[model samples]
Target: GSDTTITQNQTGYDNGYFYSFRTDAPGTVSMTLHSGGSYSTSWRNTGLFLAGKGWSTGGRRTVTYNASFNPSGNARLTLYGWTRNPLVSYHIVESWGTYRPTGTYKGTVTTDGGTYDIYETWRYNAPSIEGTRTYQQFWSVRQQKRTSGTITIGNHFDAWARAGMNLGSHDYQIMATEGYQSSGSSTVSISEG
Candidate 1:
C-alpha cells in the first residue's frame, strides 16, 4: 500500500527529541515547520542537518531541502535534535510535488518553547520541478541550536529565510538548522528578504 498522507510525531525528553514523516508515493515532497511563538534560551545559535539514502552521504545544515522521489515505494524522513529545547506551539506544513518558496516569514521568541504562526505558499513551477526531477533524491532534515539570551531588538532580530530547489532523483537533500540568541531586548521580523 502507498501512503498519501504525511505524518509527524514529536516525543522524547528535554535533552533531545525526534521527528519524522513517512510516505508511499514517488514524487517530489516538501516539509516545513514554523514556530508560532518563541523558544527558551536553551535553543539558540545551533546547527541542524538533513540526510537521505540515494542522495549524498552524511548531510547539510540548511533551512530547506527539496528532492524528488520514485514510485520506488515507501520513504521516511527523520529530524534529529542538535541543541535547543523543542518549542510547544509549533506549526508544521508539508506539500507534495515540486513547489516554490516565497513571501514574508515572521516569527517571535518568548522565554520558553514557541511556535511559528505564519502562512506559507508552495509552488510547483515547471522549470523548478524539471530541475530537481533530473537531478537526485536524498533524505533531509532541519535543526535549531540553542544560544544565550534573547535575539530581537538590541543584539537580536528575527531569523531570515533559508530555502532550496531540489533536482531529479539524484540522491540528495537540503536542510536548514541554526538558531540565534538575543543579545538585548529584541523584537524581530523576517521575510524572504
Candidate 2:
C-alpha cells in the first residue's frame, strides 16, 4: 500500500497534496491511499486519479479497483469525473457521502457488473477557490455497502447528454477517498483497461 498525506485543507483538483498519474492512454491502473492517522481540521482527501484535457469521445472508458479501509474515521470509496466549459462545470460522482445530493432522481444504470442509482444536481454560479461558475453534477451510486473486492466505474457522458447536462470536453477522472474532519487510514488497488 502507498501513503499520500494531507496535512491541511485542500480542494479536490489542482491541489499539490494529491498523488496522481499522468496518461492519455486507457488501460488498467492500480492506486492506494493509506492515511497517516493525521489530517486537517477542515477537508482532507487522498486517492488515485487520472487528469488531462481534451478527452476522446465515443469510446469506452472504464475503471475497476479494489478498496479496503481500517475504519479509524470517516471515508468511502469514490468514483468521479469532471469537465469544465467557459461558464459551466460538470461532475459525475459515485460514493457514500454524508451530504446526499438534493437533485432529481434520474433512475438507474448498470455497468461494470453493478447497478447504480443516478441523481442530478446543479448550482448556478457556485463559488469555489477556482472562482464562480454554474456547476452540474451527476451521481451513480451503488446500492450495496462495500468495503472490499472489485468495483468499477464507466463513462456516463452519454447519459448526462441525454438529460441536457453536457459539460463540453471531459477533463479529469478521479478514484479516491475524501475525508472531512477525518483520521485513520484506507487503501485502494485499481485496474483500468
Candidate 3:
C-alpha cells in the first residue's frame, strides 16, 4: 500500500512527490500524497505537506485548491513557503482552527476578491528546513476564510515589500495543514491556477 502512518519526524520524496511530516511534540499523523498534488490526511499536533514545488522569485506563481476541512483546537491550513538570504517563512492562511497564528500586524493586501491581514512574526531559535535557526515568519491571513480558491502568490509578495517585509530566493512552497498542539483532518487537491 502507498498509504503511510507516521508518528515521528520524516522528510523525503514519496513516489515523485516531495513530502515532509514533522512532529515537534508527541502526536500522530497520516498522509497519502497522490501525484499532481492531491492528498488525504489526518493529523494531531503536527505539520505536514505533500507539495514541494517552488520558483526562484515566487513570480506570479499561483495555487488553486479544493478542500474539505474539519479542525479543532489550534491549527492552520495555509499556503506555506520559505526563502533564502534572510531565511523567512511565509504563510497565506486560508483557514484556521481555534488558535489563529497572529503576531504583530503588518497592514493588509487586497487581492483575488478578498482582503488578507498581513503579519510579521519572528521564530527565535526554532526548527526549520535548515535545522535550528532564527528567522522571520511572514503571513497574509485571509480575513474571510475559505476552503478553496486561487491564490495569486505574488500579490502578497509585492505587498510584503511595501510593508518592510522582504523575501529572498524562494524555496519549497506547499499547501500545508498544521496542527498546533491540537488535532484535525483535511483533504485537499492543489494545482497551479
Candidate 4:
C-alpha cells in the first residue's frame, strides 16, 4: 500500500490499504510500505495480518515477524490483536495513535529481547472498520523506536491476563505501521521463515 505523497493539510483522508499473507510456521515476515504518506490520526500502519484461535481457552499461540522501514515521516511497526464474544462485545490489544487513551499502566515486559510498556484502556462505542462497538484494549508499546528488527507478540496477552485484563479468545493479529499526521515514503517486507 502506498500513501507516499500528500498535502500538508491531509488528515485521515491520506490513507492506503494492502494485502497480507499467512503462514503456518513461526519465523520472520517482511513488509514494505512505499513512501508518500500523511495522516492526522494517531497512526498509519502497513504490515502483515495473521489469524488464530483458543486465546480465551489459555491455549498458547503467537504471531512472530520481523519489521523494517525507512521512515521519512512519523511511524512505528505495531502488532495488533482482537477477539469477539458472540454478540456480546469485542476485545482489542494494540496501540492507539496520536491520542493515547488514559488507562492503568501495567509496567513493561521483554519479548524476543525487546522491552515494551503495557497499558490497559477502554473504548466505548468505538468506531472500527467492522462498525461501532465497545471493547477493552491492552497495549504493549516498544520503549525504543526500532526501524528494523524481529518482533514476537503472543506473550503479552499472558501479561495482560496476569494483570487482570482478560482479552477473551484469540481472533486476528495485524503487524503494521501507525502514522500520526505523518508524511514521506516507506517500504516494508514480510515473509515466514
Report the C-alpha lDDT of model 3 over 150-176, residue by residue, as the tens digit: 999989998999999999887777777
TM-score winner, 1 or 2: 2
Ordered by TM-score, highest first, the candidates read 3, 2, 4, 1
Worst 10 residues of 3 by lDDT: 48-57
Per-residue lDDT for 110-166 in model 2, tens only?
655566666777767765324776676766666655544343333455555566655
The reply for model 4, stretches above 4 Å from the true place, is: 1-64, 70-74, 86-103
Answer with 1 or 4, whichever has the higher TM-score.
4
lDDT scores of the candidates, listed in order:
0.21, 0.44, 0.74, 0.43
lDDT of 1 by residue, 59-133 (tens): 222232232221112121221212111111111212111222223344323322322223223333312212322
Q: How many clashes (backbone N, Cα, C below 3 Å) per candidate?
A: 50, 4, 0, 35
Scored by Cα lDDT, where does model 4 land?
A: 0.43
Please identify which of the two predictions, 2 or 4, would achieve the higher lDDT against the true structure: 2
TM-score per model over all chains: 0.17, 0.59, 0.86, 0.56
Q: Which candidate achieves the best lDDT against the true structure? A: 3
lDDT of 4 by residue, 38-95 (tens): 1111222323223211122222445434333434344445554455552122222233
Candidate 4 local Cα displacement, residue 137, angstroms = 1.3
